[PDB]
Amino acid sequence: NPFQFYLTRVSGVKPKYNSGALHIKDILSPLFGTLVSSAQFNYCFDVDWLVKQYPPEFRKKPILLVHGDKREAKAHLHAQAKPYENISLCQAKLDIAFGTHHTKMMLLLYEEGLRVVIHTSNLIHADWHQKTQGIWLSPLYPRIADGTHKSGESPTHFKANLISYLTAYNAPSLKEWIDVIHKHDLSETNVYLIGSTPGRFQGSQKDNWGHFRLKKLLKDHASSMSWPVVGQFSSVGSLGADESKWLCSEFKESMLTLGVPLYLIYPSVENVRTSLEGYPAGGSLPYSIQTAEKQNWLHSYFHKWSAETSGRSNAMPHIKTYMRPSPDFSKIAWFLVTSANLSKAAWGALEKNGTQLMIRSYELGVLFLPSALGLDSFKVKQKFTFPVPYDLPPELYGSKDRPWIWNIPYVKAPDTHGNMWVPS
Ligand SMILES: NC[C@@H](O)c1ccc(O)cc1
């Protein structure tokens, strides 16, 4: 299994649909290594819940929480953590407004080596219960024989890329994790790291982050051959007055690079209503009427959530993925799993006559390139060759479908649990 790409367990589907699926408890289990220390980067945290996901024997090992909370929210987080002597926090600077620290990553230091986990789930019960979420598991990275001279680097430059990502936080607690990574052999890594970090980037620095980083990797590491682009996400930023402002111009341009139809997959009201969760799934799909009414054009790009291949049609997506399938959808030129949703905040927007990339948020993903495996393309695994976790080709919204919008009421039809949705 070259990909090490997994979905989270979904409770309440047939056990067959959970066979190759992982819950956080499985990720933190002793079968994965003898835990010594860990860092949990994320957006939302339930500390009590989180600590319980660790095996009892490991529950007292040091844990660093890397978050972006401020003021009263920071207060609350610290409050959640206080009861736990072994937990420290690192507040990631968010110097630009409307930025979030959105990256989901685990750094797991064991007696036997180091593991890196890049995934899409918040550290709260509901994100791991009945949602479709994605996980990439690094291999167990051995410690470098403390008597040998080696970089421990991979052909994909993952090790240096991860260190640069951590370096940008400028945070004392992360330097220690940077030192740990220095000491390990990450050479077996076959994926590319794609990060976002807050900033306004000029010249050479453009290629380091966001969609320009992706564009750069696709230039150097794919090659060419009406192959569509597919984008799949749970949050939608303000994209501009029309497609030419950002979506089809700079964003899609990065995405189509190699060496054009755009399918966007976003849950409809109907997908949410009949989900395992019902309407409360919409709490994790925060598309506001405010934003949506500014850009009604975007919605003709939208396709339904359907995941029969993985049995998760009813498990609302909090995973985010982007990919480049062939015209018949039987193959792909690459696959990206990331925390980045469909927003300029996450991906970057060009400022000052296209000479500046402005990014608002921390985001992190892994890119699977056939070349890193010595292939030209991946065959799509038809029934959850790359494991595409949702159905192809994507299915267009019906005429009566609407995109889920979180902050309006739905009272005409009850959801899966006989409830309505009246936000307020
Ligand atoms: N339910 C919390 C809400 O703020 C939220 C919504 C979507 C996310 O990805 C993360 C958090």
UniProtKB/Swiss-Prot annotation:
Record's keyword annotation contains Glycoprotein: no
Identify which top EC class this enzyme belongs to.
hydrolase
- Phenotype when changing residue 341 to A: Reduced hydrolysis of the covalent intermediate between the active site nucleophile and DNA
Q: Which UniProt keywords apply?
A: Cytoplasm, Disease variant, DNA damage, DNA repair, Exonuclease, Hydrolase, Neurodegeneration, Nuclease, Nucleus, Phosphoprotein, Repeat
| UniProt effect for mutating residue 320 to A | Abolishes hydrolysis of the covalent intermediate between the active site nucleophile and DNA
Summarize the impact of residue 133 to A.
Answer: Slightly reduced hydrolysis of the covalent intermediate between the active site nucleophile and DNA
Q: What is the effect of changing residue 318 to A?
A: 3000-fold reduction in activity; abolishes hydrolysis of the covalent intermediate between the active site nucleophile and DNA
Interaction with DNA, as annotated region: 235-238
Q: Where does substrate bind?
A: 104, 320
Q: How does it assemble?
A: Monomer.
Family listed: Belongs to the tyrosyl-DNA phosphodiesterase family.
Instruction: Tell me the protein's name.
Output: Tyrosyl-DNA phosphodiesterase 1
